[model samples]
Target chain A: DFWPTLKDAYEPLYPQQLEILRQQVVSEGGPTATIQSRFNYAWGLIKSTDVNDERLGVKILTDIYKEAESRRRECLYYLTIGCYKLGEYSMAKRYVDT
Target chain B: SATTFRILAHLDEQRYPLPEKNLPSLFEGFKATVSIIQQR
Candidate 1:
């Protein structure tokens, strides 16, 4: 249920907003959990099985979280699911542990 | 006031990775973030 609901967040994917987010990405400030949650929410559209947005999601998530270790910790649920689905088994587990 | 101040301070310290964009409007959820974080 959560997966599908999460799936809906990114469904149809806002191509423009997605690009805008990348163009105007902010690597800091705000509660990381909230920001990363939004990022993952948008990214889920692309990363899910049907859309196969993982290509960009993999990179986007990595970039967003790498700078602050907390990004991974804050958005662990999103991180784990995204990575777990993207075939990044190790990264997924790491997120879970964090 | 301390919580709001801290949230605002953190907002000031945030780095925008955009080539360029509206910071204030974009970070609107920050206070909301603080609220939710507080709730959590």
Candidate 2:
């Protein structure tokens, strides 16, 4: 028997939709504006949105990193490789001495 | 089961498609995938 039914699966929302939601937040205020607002937006979408495609999560995460890079280049650069493990050698090389 | 299944499926398809002559970047994509997953 299946351990978990399809209905019980964690279906993530589309990246495009998440982008739209994120953009709306940016319109209201940047990422540093408020955590409560951002959490509310994410909660609303997760509760109402059906994201059956895994690619959406990847895309959303990529966009989030892009946004963070725009806000804090150093922090984002560190976190990108920390969280994604995809190092930007050129950037690192420019700042570090090997 | 699904997670295990997916992991096994990915591993099964992880064979190197290119020969040694073209291997410089052949495993890069797979490496990136594994790296990304390892982060999680």
Candidate 3:
């Protein structure tokens, strides 16, 4: 199956938890300092219940998708999830189609 | 692209609830993609 048994994807992190992710990236240098750090934060945000958080996640993922050649496919999938979470199914479909 | 197809099918149904509850059941239908993406 394509689904992951890891429950982390569906469980949104608390603000402090998310902040820890943000801090990781900050400590490295900047938001896009590293693909892993940025993706961690974005993933945390996308899983959030808040629309604003998900939006930011999409934005960050989009940034990664544009620059990270090795990560394009993976970022594309999460971007799909971000759009799905935001109820932007059309956009999600578009991302998946890529 | 297996998961990709599943998500596309869900979108085609146009039935997903908004303000998602973050339940595992929501994706009871779909793995390691998380680690690959997170580069963990």
RMSD of each: 14.8, 18.3, 12.1
Candidate 1 lDDT tens digits, A1-98 = 12223443343434654443444344443234445444633364344455245545544444555454444443355556655555556666755665
- Best-first order by TM-score: 3, 1, 2
How does chain A of every candidate compare to the true chain A by TM-score? 0.50, 0.29, 0.85
CAPRI verdict on model 2?
incorrect
Q: Model 3 segments beyond 4 Å from truth?
A: A1-8, B1-40
Better candidate number, 1 or 2, judged by DockQ: 1
**Which ranges in model 2 have alpha carbons more than 4 Å from their true place?**
A1-9, A34-36, A41-98, B1-40
Tell me how far the alpha carbon of residue A25 in candidate 2 is from the true structure, in angstroms, after superposition.
2.0
| CA shift of A75, model 2, Å | 24
Task: Give the alpha carbon lDDT tens digit for every residue of B1-40 in model 2.
Answer: 3343233212111231111232222113323433444444
Model 2 clash pairs? Answer: A12-A51
Cα lDDT for residue A47, candidate 1: 42
Report the error of model 2 at residue A67, Å. 20
Question: What are the per-residue Cα lDDT tens digits for candidate 3 across B1-40?
Answer: 3344344333321322121234332122212333343444
Q: Please give the lDDT score for candidate 3.
A: 0.60
Q: All models: lDDT? A: 0.43, 0.32, 0.60
How good is model 1 by TM-score?
0.42
Displacement of residue A5 (Cα, Å) in model 2 is 15
Specify the highest-TM-score model's number.
Answer: 3
TM-score of chain A of 1: 0.50
